[PDB]
Amino acid sequence: ATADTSPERLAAIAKDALGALNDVILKHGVTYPEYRVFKQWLIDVGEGGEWPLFLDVFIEHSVEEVLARSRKGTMGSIEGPYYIENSPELPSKCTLPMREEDEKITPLVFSGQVTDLDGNGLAGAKVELWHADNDGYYSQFAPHLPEWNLRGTIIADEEGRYEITTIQPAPYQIPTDGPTGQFIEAQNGHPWRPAHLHLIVSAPGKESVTTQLYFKGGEWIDSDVASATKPELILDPKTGDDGKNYVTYNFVLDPA
Amino acid sequence: ATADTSPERLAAIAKDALGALNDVILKHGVTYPEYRVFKQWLIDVGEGGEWPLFLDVFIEHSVEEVLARSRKGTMGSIEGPYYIENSPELPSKCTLPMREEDEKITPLVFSGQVTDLDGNGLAGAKVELWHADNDGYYSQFAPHLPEWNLRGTIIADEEGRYEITTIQPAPYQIPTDGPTGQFIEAQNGHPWRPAHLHLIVSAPGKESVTTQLYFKGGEWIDSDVASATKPELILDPKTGDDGKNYVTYNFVLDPA
Numbered sequence A, B: 001a002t003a004d005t006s007p008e009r010l011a012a013i014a015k016d017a018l019g020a021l022n023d024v025i026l027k028h029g030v031t032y033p034e035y036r037v038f039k040q041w042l043i044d045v046g047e048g049g050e051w052p053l054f055l056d057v058f059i060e061h062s063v064e065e066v067l068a069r070s071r072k073g074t075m076g077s078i079e080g081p082y083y084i085e086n087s088p089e090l091p092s093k094c095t096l097p098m099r100e101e102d103e104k105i106t107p108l109v110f111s112g113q114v115t116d117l118d119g120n121g122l123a124g125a126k127v128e129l130w131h132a133d134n135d136g137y138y139s140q141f142a143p144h145l146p147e148w149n150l151r152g153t154i155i156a157d158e159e160g161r162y163e164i165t166t167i168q169p170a171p172y173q174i175p176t177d178g179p180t181g182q183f184i185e186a187q188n189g190h191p192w193r194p195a196h197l198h199l200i201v202s203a204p205g206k207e208s209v210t211t212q213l214y215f216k217g218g219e220w221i222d223s224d225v226a227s228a229t230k231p232e233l234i235l236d237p238k239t240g241d242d243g244k245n246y247v248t249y250n251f252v253l254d255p256a
């Protein structure tokens, strides 16, 4: 991973980041035993492979908020730690790979269109979808699951349209057996994210969107630990007489 | 390492620390490639065993500045990553353990007294001294060196007095082969600390001081990378006709 960032810009960034932390230490009169604890915790985070976790939960939202200012299309949200490139392709109407366990869950039938800013539909458009099972696990991050469980790259039709069936997602708890969970327990916080779908939406000559969709009335939307929920990204699915949840959502892409 | 810190206090601390970093990201419009770089770097820091290094260089000064407000005695400074408890004891007049290589360097003869706040001298007083050799290495952090090279716990006399001979320290460069060195190179900074002695000064029923002594006119005192130099901690040794550097410095301890 490489970035074009000047010595100048890094210097200014570092200056107020360090300045900022240092001022927090001065403000609260952080002590030597606390500095000790903070230092051990930083070590434990890395030793626990939790940098992607801690940073995406606690910091990434700021980074998207930056990106957000330059974009007129569908609201984005954080990627999170669990995205895997090249999930196998599916046709514009499809059902996500899933186990027999998953088939037991209320289906969710997610329809819509990928359009440009003027509302025109786009051919060659892809919706990469991923989310957790009802147990709270993500495939390839849980050894029991098939590697593409609840993951696919949906090939939208010539109109930019898709109809994707999956399971209704459930509120999800971040891992709490390690230093991120410790950091949350020590301050009486909670480790919950709302029920969500993760998506990256793309089309030839367009700027992709990495986003998340949430469910109206769902638990923790007002208190997402990752601070990644936006009012515009909340779905209101209607129940069918087949008992499936139905919802239509359109994506609106900026030009690249 | 454990601290008595309430869920409340940790929550308030975390809030503005995260708030602070997040505001820096917003201020400078930190981008996704940069967030990527920052995330890889955090991983590399831990993988490189550089948390003690990075934090002591870039953060500890704030933590001492906190401690500093409550103390009337000799100015403190940061401990740094290289302190080792229980260096072998030496008599109040002594010379530090050293190699034949070291014997070649201008001697430094460091005299003084440990006193209370009213200027009274203290029996049972200890001066734990450590510093780098002229090559820039610290013992037990460089496989070629005897484990106590330039380290000792000096037993001051019934008056609180000591006379300690060692080598004149030289400006010292922090390791730059890893992520801390990378962080400094990318912003065109420098990796230098001034020539310094490290000391922890203690006496029965007194609050210890962890401090550093520096040398007048020495290189980098105005630009210490660790931001740990204070005007009050600068020595002005006089040269003898034996060609040794001579200096007297007194310690003043607060009550525990």
Ligand SMILES: Oc1cccc(O)c1O
Residues within 6 Å of the ligand: A053, A056, A057, A078, A079, A080, A081, A082, A172, A174, A193, A226, A228
């Ligand atoms: O952004 C996130 C952070 C942690 C866990 C997740 O499932 C997630 O989407």
Ligand SMILES: Oc1cccc(O)c1O
Residues within 6 Å of the ligand: B053, B056, B057, B078, B079, B080, B081, B082, B172, B174, B193, B226, B228
């Ligand atoms: O505080 C310090 C930080 C890095 C290297 C040192 O020798 C030191 O005293």
Ligand SMILES: [Fe+3]
Residues within 6 Å of the ligand: A080, A082, A131, A132, A196, A198
């Ligand atoms: Fe997720």
Ligand SMILES: [Fe+3]
Residues within 6 Å of the ligand: B080, B082, B131, B132, B196, B198
């Ligand atoms: Fe040092």
